């Protein structure tokens, strides 16, 4: 069988639809046209904007990358990451909310939304996390560690922001 990630699933179904080389070129045309439409419509629906330089500077000077519409968080469960999104969403309006974009594993997640919303998210996560040499601390009372960073992407895939791009 075959499948794909956030973007590769179309290629997976196309390869499943493969045939002799002449039909394979048509299959490739189909996949390429579909991805072209997806990308163009998603960007038109949610074009990324300028990002406040003070905000990216604050993000950068705390061991963080450039803010992106997706924020990967590792070493945390879906339930903990979800509770943090619920805090951020409760304190954000619905239209700049954060939602679970993809669950790469038990301790690997990526969350979609506006870069500003995910920066505030990362502020909250940095406040709650620890840098710490906790070997001398009991495991039950040990602070949780995590290495969260923004992925290299310019679109919040798997989010309500691009939901209105669907019908188009």
């Amino acid at each position: 069988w075959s499948t794909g990630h956030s973007q590769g699933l179309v290629t997976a179904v196309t390869i499943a639809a493969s045939d002799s080389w002449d039909s394979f070129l048509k299959n490739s045309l189909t996949a390429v046209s579909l991805l072209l439409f997806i990308g163009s419509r998603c960007l038109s629906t949610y074009p990324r904007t300028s990002l406040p330089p003070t905000m990216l500077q604050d993000s950068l000077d705390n061991g963080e990358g450039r803010p992106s519409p997706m924020l990967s968080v590792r070493d945390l469960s879906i339930k903990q990451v979800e509770k943090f999104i619920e805090q951020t969403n409760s304190h954000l309006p619905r239209e700049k909310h954060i939602a679970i974009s993809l669950i790469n594993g038990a301790r690997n997640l990526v969350l979609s939304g506006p870069p500003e919303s995910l920066y505030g998210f990362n502020l909250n996560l940095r406040n709650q996390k620890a840098p710490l040499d906790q070997s001398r601390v009991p495991f039950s009372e040990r602070k949780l560690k995590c290495s969260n960073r923004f992925l290299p992407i310019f679109a919040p895939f798997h989010s309500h922001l691009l939901a209105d791009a669907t019908e188009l």
Partner: peptide
């Protein structure tokens, strides 16, 4: 100009 204030967003 890439400023957010001048790009159509929901609820804004």
């Amino acid at each position: 100009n890439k400023c957010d204030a001048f790009v159509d967003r929901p609820g804004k």
